[PDB]
Amino acid sequence: SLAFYIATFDIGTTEVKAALADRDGGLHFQRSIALETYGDGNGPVEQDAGDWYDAVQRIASSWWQSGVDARRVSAIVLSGQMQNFLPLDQDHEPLHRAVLYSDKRPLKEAEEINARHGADNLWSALENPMTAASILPKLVFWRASFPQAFGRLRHVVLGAKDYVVLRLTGRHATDRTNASTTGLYRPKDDAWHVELLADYGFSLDLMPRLLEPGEQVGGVSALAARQTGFVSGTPVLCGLGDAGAATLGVGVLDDEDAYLHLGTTGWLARLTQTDPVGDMPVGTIFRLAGIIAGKTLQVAPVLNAGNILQWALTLVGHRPGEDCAEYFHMAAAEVQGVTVPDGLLFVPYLHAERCPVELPAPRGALLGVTGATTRAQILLAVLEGAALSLRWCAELLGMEKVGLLKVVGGGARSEAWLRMIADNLNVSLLVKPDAHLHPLRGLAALAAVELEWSHSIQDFLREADLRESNILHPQPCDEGRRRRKFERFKQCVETLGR
Amino acid sequence: SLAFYIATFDIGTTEVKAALADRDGGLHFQRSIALETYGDGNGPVEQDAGDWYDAVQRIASSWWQSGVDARRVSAIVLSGQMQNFLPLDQDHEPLHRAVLYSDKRPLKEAEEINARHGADNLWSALENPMTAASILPKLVFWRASFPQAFGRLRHVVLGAKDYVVLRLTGRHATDRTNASTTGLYRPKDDAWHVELLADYGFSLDLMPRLLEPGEQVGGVSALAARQTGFVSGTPVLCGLGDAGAATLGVGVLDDEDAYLHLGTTGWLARLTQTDPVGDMPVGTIFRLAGIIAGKTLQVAPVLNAGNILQWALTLVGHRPGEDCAEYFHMAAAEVQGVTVPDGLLFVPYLHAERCPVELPAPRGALLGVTGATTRAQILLAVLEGAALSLRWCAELLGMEKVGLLKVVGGGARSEAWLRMIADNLNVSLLVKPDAHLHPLRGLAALAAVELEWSHSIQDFLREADLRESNILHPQPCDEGRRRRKFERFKQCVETLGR
Ligand SMILES: Nc1ncnc2c1ncn2[C@@H]1O[C@H](COP(=O)(O)OP(=O)(O)O)[C@@H](O)[C@H]1O
Ligand SMILES: Nc1ncnc2c1ncn2[C@@H]1O[C@H](COP(=O)(O)OP(=O)(O)O)[C@@H](O)[C@H]1O
């Protein structure tokens, strides 16, 4: 016999990762192409969409030239950045650089939209945040500044991998998981928010068609075949937003499954059965549809995360231009066998925050310092404080029934932090290494089901897994005492607001 | 000719310092005897009074055996600990260990006294604090626990050097500066608080006679001559409390002269013309009489001072048993050329405080931390925060007309701190080295006037001074901006109180 593969891609924020997936869950011919970002962190966060496809071309070229036969690639499926704004003309050419999710320039427009429609009405219909990062504001903001370009507007792409899917098949579509993030989509009606788009003079024709991740969008076109070297007619599946693929990739499949992304920034996620939406949160809470039939990923986005620890390296003598390796090492060494006093408390919002609280301005403090306070206790309180933010998020997400938390990211390198998190959230943790491959595993599994390589996604992931860890469980604690420090921690955030 | 000398002593908290003073302001045959303190910092702070005299004997012996002729000693004068409680019997023997000023065990008794008499009445009459450290509470507390000993009570010594003066002459006296500290003395009537002592069943006979520092208490008695080797009849002057002698010693003589003691703990002092006492302060403010005719030293006692800096060495890696030298060095190096952000604020009450605020419990915090905050900025903010406490104290003392601040103590070793203090208090500083000799210079000068060696104290100090510095002046500042950070600093202390 001969090997067949699924071409998997992630169009991520800083790079494009790819691999050819065999039926046994093996990921081969792994590739990585770096993408540039524009804006220098002064407000704008943009990319040239062509770079994404350019990246896909380069990877496919490198595959054929590495002896891979494009006919043995039985399907193409991608994940990528969610919540983009990308305006295209009639020939599918960008009218503007892609504006990324982290761009939040349109403050006044989001304010207006919320005022005009009612925040409770919008929340009630979208089940998600309407903020400066949402697509409607970015679209309004753009129409006003570029009226000519706007005249030529024909399509609005809302996820990075959707553009590449467009380049490949010539059809404009997206997944419900990504749609959720946009603040343009109604989960309950399963449709774009018609009256809201019409009220601002935007046609439905601008919207992509909604598709299941496993549905075929179309086949690779003759032209795309010439551009990439894929075989014309090779199935291109819809795929899904990277949050969806990453969580699928690590086995987040069942009710009360949960996930934690601990990078420079982070997010905590709880999968559950789709329920009637509750009252507006006083903390940005996403509810992503479409990852599993009948289930919703409840996500709390965290802006102060692994960056809190990174900051604290200053405490052990780190300076602006130095490699951080030796300092993470000292910090870990120093907090060994240390205990944090009930009175010592670190509030970790060194940057503006969304969850668990809206803080447009930082609120960073070290409280309860006495003469007996050591630097080691400080370092630890930082981890504790960061973990208390996380417990706050879990409380918002309703995670009291979650048994196990899948953890990814560089943040998990702090053994001391993990311990803080398990203990304070009172949940077990399992670390999942190689976070860059996760969305690819998820995609490969959904593709495998569609190709009839496997009966289910679950079955697929569990096999690759025999291919290759000990769960970390919480120490026993004075529930009630950890709980009192937790409430005080809440009172401190409020009190620091004056 | 041949040298004549004044025997000067300071009966301090941790040691007895002494020297023979010539007429040119020279201090010779310097001695130091260490004293032990009992209580292990668990509440009690006591010493054996006999140790004080024992120390004086040993020093005088060492003088005669070093070729000094006791007849050339023309007067004996001492300073020492103020605000002691020392109960003696009819033979002048202690009925209890001397209870030092820092002892504050009698919480309930001070509370009772204040309730019974009115805090405003007491303040109005005593012009000083009535607290657990005051002599009346300690006396009540002692009578209740030792009724037998109390039956034998005949004299109550209120300053350490007064006991030694008692051992030397056989007369019981004290100075008005020390009397002030006791909460038993009425400045305006110039007398002990009769109704207050009588109301608690204590006779006036227990009180020492009030004397000027320069007045002769008596001559060395035959017996004391045998015990010490001094010449019988050698004048023993009354002398004064160490705060009085230390400030005299450095030239604090004129209205709006000021003084700063920056040790582990500290105090700030402003000399001014005796005025009608104002309303009770919400911050422990002493008003000491008797140092200069018609003038009053206004003192703010600080409990968080050089100990704040000492604590901060933890930040640069200091650990419990290590020598501190190299760490003070790094901290100084690290804050060089650094600026403290207007938003970064350190509240330095790592221990309970009296001035500028009553804080029975610590209130230590680092506020306004952002991601850009460095350790160096932290170190500096600590100094700034400590200095802001000091500015608060100056504001309480009414120091807006003070031109120059005489500074003593190990605290002054931080060049960076001095700069913070000058800038924030907006006053010039002059550091006075060898703080242990200060009370001796002061005593020697007052003695010199009495012996007709010099026409005035001022004249005396200014000469020794030709024997041997650049004043440090404040940088120009946005008054108004330093002032806004100062007010915020006040608001933060209150807000941290919940
Ligand atoms: N050696 C380490 N030990 C502890 N944490 C680490 C270490 N190195 C990196 N980190 C953490 O990794 C975080 C970023 O991880 P990462 O997964 O690359 O997220 P991101 O792609 O968002 O920057 C940092 O903020 C830091 O706290
Ligand atoms: N090398 C130094 N540099 C800066 N400050 C110093 C240094 N060494 C000692 N100190 C300060 O000295 C203070 C104590 O000084 P000191 O005059 O002996 O007062 P005390 O007798 O009350 O303990 C400490 O709290 C510390 O901050």
JSON list of N, CA and C in Angstrom, two decimals, chain A residues 311 314-317 319 334 349-351 362-371 373-375 378 491-492 495-496 498, chain B residues 311 314-317 319 334 349-351 362-371 373-375 378 491-492 495-496 498:
[
{"chain": "A", "resi": 311, "resn": "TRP", "atom": "N", "xyz": [6.62, 39.69, 33.93]},
{"chain": "A", "resi": 311, "resn": "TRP", "atom": "CA", "xyz": [6.91, 40.99, 34.49]},
{"chain": "A", "resi": 311, "resn": "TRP", "atom": "C", "xyz": [7.71, 40.82, 35.76]},
{"chain": "A", "resi": 314, "resn": "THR", "atom": "N", "xyz": [11.57, 41.04, 36.77]},
{"chain": "A", "resi": 314, "resn": "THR", "atom": "CA", "xyz": [12.24, 42.26, 37.18]},
{"chain": "A", "resi": 314, "resn": "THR", "atom": "C", "xyz": [12.68, 42.13, 38.63]},
{"chain": "A", "resi": 315, "resn": "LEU", "atom": "N", "xyz": [11.88, 41.42, 39.42]},
{"chain": "A", "resi": 315, "resn": "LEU", "atom": "CA", "xyz": [12.12, 41.28, 40.85]},
{"chain": "A", "resi": 315, "resn": "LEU", "atom": "C", "xyz": [13.39, 40.53, 41.18]},
{"chain": "A", "resi": 316, "resn": "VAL", "atom": "N", "xyz": [13.80, 39.62, 40.31]},
{"chain": "A", "resi": 316, "resn": "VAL", "atom": "CA", "xyz": [15.02, 38.86, 40.50]},
{"chain": "A", "resi": 316, "resn": "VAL", "atom": "C", "xyz": [16.13, 39.40, 39.61]},
{"chain": "A", "resi": 317, "resn": "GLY", "atom": "N", "xyz": [15.96, 40.61, 39.11]},
{"chain": "A", "resi": 317, "resn": "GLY", "atom": "CA", "xyz": [17.07, 41.34, 38.51]},
{"chain": "A", "resi": 317, "resn": "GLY", "atom": "C", "xyz": [17.11, 41.35, 36.99]},
{"chain": "A", "resi": 319, "resn": "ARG", "atom": "N", "xyz": [16.52, 42.57, 33.30]},
{"chain": "A", "resi": 319, "resn": "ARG", "atom": "CA", "xyz": [16.52, 43.87, 32.63]},
{"chain": "A", "resi": 319, "resn": "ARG", "atom": "C", "xyz": [16.12, 43.73, 31.16]},
{"chain": "A", "resi": 334, "resn": "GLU", "atom": "N", "xyz": [13.24, 30.03, 43.92]},
{"chain": "A", "resi": 334, "resn": "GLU", "atom": "CA", "xyz": [12.97, 30.85, 45.09]},
{"chain": "A", "resi": 334, "resn": "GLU", "atom": "C", "xyz": [11.60, 30.59, 45.73]},
{"chain": "A", "resi": 349, "resn": "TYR", "atom": "N", "xyz": [-3.48, 42.90, 37.59]},
{"chain": "A", "resi": 349, "resn": "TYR", "atom": "CA", "xyz": [-3.91, 43.56, 36.37]},
{"chain": "A", "resi": 349, "resn": "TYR", "atom": "C", "xyz": [-2.94, 44.67, 35.96]},
{"chain": "A", "resi": 350, "resn": "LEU", "atom": "N", "xyz": [-1.76, 44.25, 35.54]},
{"chain": "A", "resi": 350, "resn": "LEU", "atom": "CA", "xyz": [-0.70, 45.16, 35.11]},
{"chain": "A", "resi": 350, "resn": "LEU", "atom": "C", "xyz": [-1.01, 45.74, 33.72]},
{"chain": "A", "resi": 351, "resn": "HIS", "atom": "N", "xyz": [-1.99, 45.14, 33.05]},
{"chain": "A", "resi": 351, "resn": "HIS", "atom": "CA", "xyz": [-2.50, 45.65, 31.79]},
{"chain": "A", "resi": 351, "resn": "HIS", "atom": "C", "xyz": [-4.02, 45.75, 31.88]},
{"chain": "A", "resi": 362, "resn": "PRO", "atom": "N", "xyz": [-4.95, 49.72, 33.93]},
{"chain": "A", "resi": 362, "resn": "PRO", "atom": "CA", "xyz": [-4.31, 48.77, 34.84]},
{"chain": "A", "resi": 362, "resn": "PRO", "atom": "C", "xyz": [-4.72, 48.99, 36.30]},
{"chain": "A", "resi": 363, "resn": "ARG", "atom": "N", "xyz": [-4.70, 47.92, 37.08]},
{"chain": "A", "resi": 363, "resn": "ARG", "atom": "CA", "xyz": [-4.94, 48.00, 38.51]},
{"chain": "A", "resi": 363, "resn": "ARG", "atom": "C", "xyz": [-3.99, 46.99, 39.15]},
{"chain": "A", "resi": 364, "resn": "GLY", "atom": "N", "xyz": [-2.71, 47.34, 39.23]},
{"chain": "A", "resi": 364, "resn": "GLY", "atom": "CA", "xyz": [-1.70, 46.47, 39.81]},
{"chain": "A", "resi": 364, "resn": "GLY", "atom": "C", "xyz": [-1.26, 46.92, 41.21]},
{"chain": "A", "resi": 365, "resn": "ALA", "atom": "N", "xyz": [-1.27, 45.99, 42.16]},
{"chain": "A", "resi": 365, "resn": "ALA", "atom": "CA", "xyz": [-0.93, 46.32, 43.54]},
{"chain": "A", "resi": 365, "resn": "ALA", "atom": "C", "xyz": [-0.35, 45.14, 44.30]},
{"chain": "A", "resi": 366, "resn": "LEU", "atom": "N", "xyz": [0.52, 45.42, 45.26]},
{"chain": "A", "resi": 366, "resn": "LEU", "atom": "CA", "xyz": [0.90, 44.41, 46.26]},
{"chain": "A", "resi": 366, "resn": "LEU", "atom": "C", "xyz": [0.41, 44.88, 47.62]},
{"chain": "A", "resi": 367, "resn": "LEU", "atom": "N", "xyz": [-0.49, 44.11, 48.22]},
{"chain": "A", "resi": 367, "resn": "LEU", "atom": "CA", "xyz": [-1.14, 44.51, 49.46]},
{"chain": "A", "resi": 367, "resn": "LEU", "atom": "C", "xyz": [-0.73, 43.68, 50.66]},
{"chain": "A", "resi": 368, "resn": "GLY", "atom": "N", "xyz": [-0.89, 44.23, 51.84]},
{"chain": "A", "resi": 368, "resn": "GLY", "atom": "CA", "xyz": [-0.61, 43.49, 53.05]},
{"chain": "A", "resi": 368, "resn": "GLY", "atom": "C", "xyz": [0.86, 43.21, 53.26]},
{"chain": "A", "resi": 369, "resn": "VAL", "atom": "N", "xyz": [1.72, 44.09, 52.76]},
{"chain": "A", "resi": 369, "resn": "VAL", "atom": "CA", "xyz": [3.15, 43.93, 53.02]},
{"chain": "A", "resi": 369, "resn": "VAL", "atom": "C", "xyz": [3.42, 44.25, 54.48]},
{"chain": "A", "resi": 370, "resn": "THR", "atom": "N", "xyz": [4.11, 43.35, 55.19]},
{"chain": "A", "resi": 370, "resn": "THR", "atom": "CA", "xyz": [4.61, 43.67, 56.53]},
{"chain": "A", "resi": 370, "resn": "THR", "atom": "C", "xyz": [6.13, 43.54, 56.55]},
{"chain": "A", "resi": 371, "resn": "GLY", "atom": "N", "xyz": [6.74, 43.74, 57.71]},
{"chain": "A", "resi": 371, "resn": "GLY", "atom": "CA", "xyz": [8.18, 43.64, 57.80]},
{"chain": "A", "resi": 371, "resn": "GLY", "atom": "C", "xyz": [8.70, 42.23, 57.58]},
{"chain": "A", "resi": 373, "resn": "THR", "atom": "N", "xyz": [7.61, 40.15, 55.34]},
{"chain": "A", "resi": 373, "resn": "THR", "atom": "CA", "xyz": [7.43, 39.80, 53.93]},
{"chain": "A", "resi": 373, "resn": "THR", "atom": "C", "xyz": [8.77, 39.62, 53.24]},
{"chain": "A", "resi": 374, "resn": "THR", "atom": "N", "xyz": [8.95, 38.49, 52.56]},
{"chain": "A", "resi": 374, "resn": "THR", "atom": "CA", "xyz": [10.22, 38.24, 51.86]},
{"chain": "A", "resi": 374, "resn": "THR", "atom": "C", "xyz": [9.98, 38.38, 50.37]},
{"chain": "A", "resi": 375, "resn": "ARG", "atom": "N", "xyz": [11.05, 38.45, 49.58]},
{"chain": "A", "resi": 375, "resn": "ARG", "atom": "CA", "xyz": [10.86, 38.49, 48.13]},
{"chain": "A", "resi": 375, "resn": "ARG", "atom": "C", "xyz": [10.22, 37.18, 47.64]},
{"chain": "A", "resi": 378, "resn": "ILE", "atom": "N", "xyz": [6.71, 37.22, 47.88]},
{"chain": "A", "resi": 378, "resn": "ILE", "atom": "CA", "xyz": [6.19, 38.09, 46.86]},
{"chain": "A", "resi": 378, "resn": "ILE", "atom": "C", "xyz": [6.05, 37.30, 45.56]},
{"chain": "A", "resi": 491, "resn": "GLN", "atom": "N", "xyz": [-12.87, 42.01, 46.80]},
{"chain": "A", "resi": 491, "resn": "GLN", "atom": "CA", "xyz": [-13.06, 43.30, 47.47]},
{"chain": "A", "resi": 491, "resn": "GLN", "atom": "C", "xyz": [-11.91, 44.29, 47.21]},
{"chain": "A", "resi": 492, "resn": "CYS", "atom": "N", "xyz": [-10.70, 43.77, 47.03]},
{"chain": "A", "resi": 492, "resn": "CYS", "atom": "CA", "xyz": [-9.52, 44.59, 46.80]},
{"chain": "A", "resi": 492, "resn": "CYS", "atom": "C", "xyz": [-9.51, 45.22, 45.43]},
{"chain": "A", "resi": 495, "resn": "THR", "atom": "N", "xyz": [-12.11, 48.01, 45.69]},
{"chain": "A", "resi": 495, "resn": "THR", "atom": "CA", "xyz": [-11.54, 49.07, 46.52]},
{"chain": "A", "resi": 495, "resn": "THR", "atom": "C", "xyz": [-10.40, 49.85, 45.84]},
{"chain": "A", "resi": 496, "resn": "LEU", "atom": "N", "xyz": [-9.57, 49.18, 45.05]},
{"chain": "A", "resi": 496, "resn": "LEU", "atom": "CA", "xyz": [-8.51, 49.90, 44.34]},
{"chain": "A", "resi": 496, "resn": "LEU", "atom": "C", "xyz": [-9.05, 50.80, 43.24]},
{"chain": "A", "resi": 498, "resn": "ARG", "atom": "N", "xyz": [-11.01, 53.02, 43.85]},
{"chain": "A", "resi": 498, "resn": "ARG", "atom": "CA", "xyz": [-11.40, 54.20, 44.62]},
{"chain": "A", "resi": 498, "resn": "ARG", "atom": "C", "xyz": [-12.92, 54.21, 44.82]},
{"chain": "B", "resi": 311, "resn": "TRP", "atom": "N", "xyz": [14.07, 46.59, 55.16]},
{"chain": "B", "resi": 311, "resn": "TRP", "atom": "CA", "xyz": [13.18, 45.54, 54.74]},
{"chain": "B", "resi": 311, "resn": "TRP", "atom": "C", "xyz": [13.35, 45.31, 53.25]},
{"chain": "B", "resi": 314, "resn": "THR", "atom": "N", "xyz": [15.35, 42.70, 50.96]},
{"chain": "B", "resi": 314, "resn": "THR", "atom": "CA", "xyz": [14.81, 41.43, 50.53]},
{"chain": "B", "resi": 314, "resn": "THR", "atom": "C", "xyz": [14.66, 41.44, 49.01]},
{"chain": "B", "resi": 315, "resn": "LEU", "atom": "N", "xyz": [14.34, 42.61, 48.47]},
{"chain": "B", "resi": 315, "resn": "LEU", "atom": "CA", "xyz": [14.07, 42.75, 47.05]},
{"chain": "B", "resi": 315, "resn": "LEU", "atom": "C", "xyz": [15.28, 42.49, 46.17]},
{"chain": "B", "resi": 316, "resn": "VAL", "atom": "N", "xyz": [16.47, 42.76, 46.70]},
{"chain": "B", "resi": 316, "resn": "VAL", "atom": "CA", "xyz": [17.70, 42.52, 45.97]},
{"chain": "B", "resi": 316, "resn": "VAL", "atom": "C", "xyz": [18.38, 41.25, 46.47]},
{"chain": "B", "resi": 317, "resn": "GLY", "atom": "N", "xyz": [17.63, 40.41, 47.17]},
{"chain": "B", "resi": 317, "resn": "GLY", "atom": "CA", "xyz": [18.08, 39.05, 47.44]},
{"chain": "B", "resi": 317, "resn": "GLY", "atom": "C", "xyz": [18.64, 38.79, 48.82]},
{"chain": "B", "resi": 319, "resn": "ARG", "atom": "N", "xyz": [18.77, 37.76, 52.61]},
{"chain": "B", "resi": 319, "resn": "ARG", "atom": "CA", "xyz": [18.14, 36.72, 53.42]},
{"chain": "B", "resi": 319, "resn": "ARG", "atom": "C", "xyz": [18.50, 36.87, 54.90]},
{"chain": "B", "resi": 334, "resn": "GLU", "atom": "N", "xyz": [21.25, 50.62, 42.16]},
{"chain": "B", "resi": 334, "resn": "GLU", "atom": "CA", "xyz": [20.10, 50.39, 41.31]},
{"chain": "B", "resi": 334, "resn": "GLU", "atom": "C", "xyz": [19.16, 51.59, 41.17]},
{"chain": "B", "resi": 349, "resn": "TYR", "atom": "N", "xyz": [4.05, 51.58, 55.88]},
{"chain": "B", "resi": 349, "resn": "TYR", "atom": "CA", "xyz": [3.76, 51.21, 57.27]},
{"chain": "B", "resi": 349, "resn": "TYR", "atom": "C", "xyz": [3.79, 49.70, 57.46]},
{"chain": "B", "resi": 350, "resn": "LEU", "atom": "N", "xyz": [4.99, 49.14, 57.35]},
{"chain": "B", "resi": 350, "resn": "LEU", "atom": "CA", "xyz": [5.21, 47.71, 57.51]},
{"chain": "B", "resi": 350, "resn": "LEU", "atom": "C", "xyz": [5.13, 47.29, 58.98]},
{"chain": "B", "resi": 351, "resn": "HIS", "atom": "N", "xyz": [5.14, 48.28, 59.87]},
{"chain": "B", "resi": 351, "resn": "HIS", "atom": "CA", "xyz": [4.92, 48.08, 61.28]},
{"chain": "B", "resi": 351, "resn": "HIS", "atom": "C", "xyz": [3.83, 49.04, 61.76]},
{"chain": "B", "resi": 362, "resn": "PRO", "atom": "N", "xyz": [-0.18, 47.07, 60.79]},
{"chain": "B", "resi": 362, "resn": "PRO", "atom": "CA", "xyz": [0.55, 47.47, 59.58]},
{"chain": "B", "resi": 362, "resn": "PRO", "atom": "C", "xyz": [-0.39, 47.80, 58.42]},
{"chain": "B", "resi": 363, "resn": "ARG", "atom": "N", "xyz": [0.07, 48.68, 57.54]},
{"chain": "B", "resi": 363, "resn": "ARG", "atom": "CA", "xyz": [-0.65, 48.99, 56.31]},
{"chain": "B", "resi": 363, "resn": "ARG", "atom": "C", "xyz": [0.40, 49.18, 55.23]},
{"chain": "B", "resi": 364, "resn": "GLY", "atom": "N", "xyz": [0.98, 48.07, 54.75]},
{"chain": "B", "resi": 364, "resn": "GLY", "atom": "CA", "xyz": [2.00, 48.12, 53.72]},
{"chain": "B", "resi": 364, "resn": "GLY", "atom": "C", "xyz": [1.48, 47.70, 52.35]},
{"chain": "B", "resi": 365, "resn": "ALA", "atom": "N", "xyz": [1.76, 48.53, 51.33]},
{"chain": "B", "resi": 365, "resn": "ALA", "atom": "CA", "xyz": [1.26, 48.25, 49.99]},
{"chain": "B", "resi": 365, "resn": "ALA", "atom": "C", "xyz": [2.16, 48.83, 48.91]},
{"chain": "B", "resi": 366, "resn": "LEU", "atom": "N", "xyz": [2.19, 48.18, 47.75]},
{"chain": "B", "resi": 366, "resn": "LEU", "atom": "CA", "xyz": [2.75, 48.81, 46.54]},
{"chain": "B", "resi": 366, "resn": "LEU", "atom": "C", "xyz": [1.64, 48.99, 45.54]},
{"chain": "B", "resi": 367, "resn": "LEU", "atom": "N", "xyz": [1.36, 50.25, 45.20]},
{"chain": "B", "resi": 367, "resn": "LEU", "atom": "CA", "xyz": [0.21, 50.58, 44.34]},
{"chain": "B", "resi": 367, "resn": "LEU", "atom": "C", "xyz": [0.61, 51.08, 42.97]},
{"chain": "B", "resi": 368, "resn": "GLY", "atom": "N", "xyz": [-0.29, 50.95, 42.02]},
{"chain": "B", "resi": 368, "resn": "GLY", "atom": "CA", "xyz": [-0.04, 51.48, 40.70]},
{"chain": "B", "resi": 368, "resn": "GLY", "atom": "C", "xyz": [1.02, 50.74, 39.93]},
{"chain": "B", "resi": 369, "resn": "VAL", "atom": "N", "xyz": [1.17, 49.44, 40.21]},
{"chain": "B", "resi": 369, "resn": "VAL", "atom": "CA", "xyz": [2.10, 48.64, 39.44]},
{"chain": "B", "resi": 369, "resn": "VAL", "atom": "C", "xyz": [1.55, 48.44, 38.04]},
{"chain": "B", "resi": 370, "resn": "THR", "atom": "N", "xyz": [2.34, 48.73, 37.01]},
{"chain": "B", "resi": 370, "resn": "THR", "atom": "CA", "xyz": [1.97, 48.35, 35.64]},
{"chain": "B", "resi": 370, "resn": "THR", "atom": "C", "xyz": [3.04, 47.44, 35.06]},
{"chain": "B", "resi": 371, "resn": "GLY", "atom": "N", "xyz": [2.88, 47.05, 33.80]},
{"chain": "B", "resi": 371, "resn": "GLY", "atom": "CA", "xyz": [3.84, 46.17, 33.18]},
{"chain": "B", "resi": 371, "resn": "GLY", "atom": "C", "xyz": [5.21, 46.82, 32.99]},
{"chain": "B", "resi": 373, "resn": "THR", "atom": "N", "xyz": [6.70, 48.73, 35.15]},
{"chain": "B", "resi": 373, "resn": "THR", "atom": "CA", "xyz": [7.33, 48.90, 36.46]},
{"chain": "B", "resi": 373, "resn": "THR", "atom": "C", "xyz": [8.57, 48.03, 36.59]},
{"chain": "B", "resi": 374, "resn": "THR", "atom": "N", "xyz": [9.69, 48.62, 36.98]},
{"chain": "B", "resi": 374, "resn": "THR", "atom": "CA", "xyz": [10.93, 47.86, 37.13]},
{"chain": "B", "resi": 374, "resn": "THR", "atom": "C", "xyz": [11.21, 47.69, 38.62]},
{"chain": "B", "resi": 375, "resn": "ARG", "atom": "N", "xyz": [12.14, 46.81, 38.97]},
{"chain": "B", "resi": 375, "resn": "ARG", "atom": "CA", "xyz": [12.52, 46.70, 40.37]},
{"chain": "B", "resi": 375, "resn": "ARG", "atom": "C", "xyz": [13.16, 48.01, 40.87]},
{"chain": "B", "resi": 378, "resn": "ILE", "atom": "N", "xyz": [10.77, 50.37, 41.91]},
{"chain": "B", "resi": 378, "resn": "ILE", "atom": "CA", "xyz": [10.21, 49.93, 43.17]},
{"chain": "B", "resi": 378, "resn": "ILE", "atom": "C", "xyz": [11.11, 50.41, 44.30]},
{"chain": "B", "resi": 491, "resn": "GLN", "atom": "N", "xyz": [-4.75, 59.88, 50.64]},
{"chain": "B", "resi": 491, "resn": "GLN", "atom": "CA", "xyz": [-5.98, 59.16, 50.28]},
{"chain": "B", "resi": 491, "resn": "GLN", "atom": "C", "xyz": [-5.81, 57.64, 50.25]},
{"chain": "B", "resi": 492, "resn": "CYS", "atom": "N", "xyz": [-4.61, 57.18, 49.91]},
{"chain": "B", "resi": 492, "resn": "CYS", "atom": "CA", "xyz": [-4.31, 55.75, 49.81]},
{"chain": "B", "resi": 492, "resn": "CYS", "atom": "C", "xyz": [-4.23, 55.09, 51.17]},
{"chain": "B", "resi": 495, "resn": "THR", "atom": "N", "xyz": [-7.89, 54.85, 52.27]},
{"chain": "B", "resi": 495, "resn": "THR", "atom": "CA", "xyz": [-8.53, 53.81, 51.46]},
{"chain": "B", "resi": 495, "resn": "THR", "atom": "C", "xyz": [-8.07, 52.39, 51.79]},
{"chain": "B", "resi": 496, "resn": "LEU", "atom": "N", "xyz": [-6.80, 52.19, 52.12]},
{"chain": "B", "resi": 496, "resn": "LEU", "atom": "CA", "xyz": [-6.34, 50.86, 52.49]},
{"chain": "B", "resi": 496, "resn": "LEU", "atom": "C", "xyz": [-6.90, 50.41, 53.84]},
{"chain": "B", "resi": 498, "resn": "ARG", "atom": "N", "xyz": [-9.88, 50.20, 54.31]},
{"chain": "B", "resi": 498, "resn": "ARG", "atom": "CA", "xyz": [-11.20, 49.72, 53.91]},
{"chain": "B", "resi": 498, "resn": "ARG", "atom": "C", "xyz": [-12.27, 50.76, 54.27]}
]
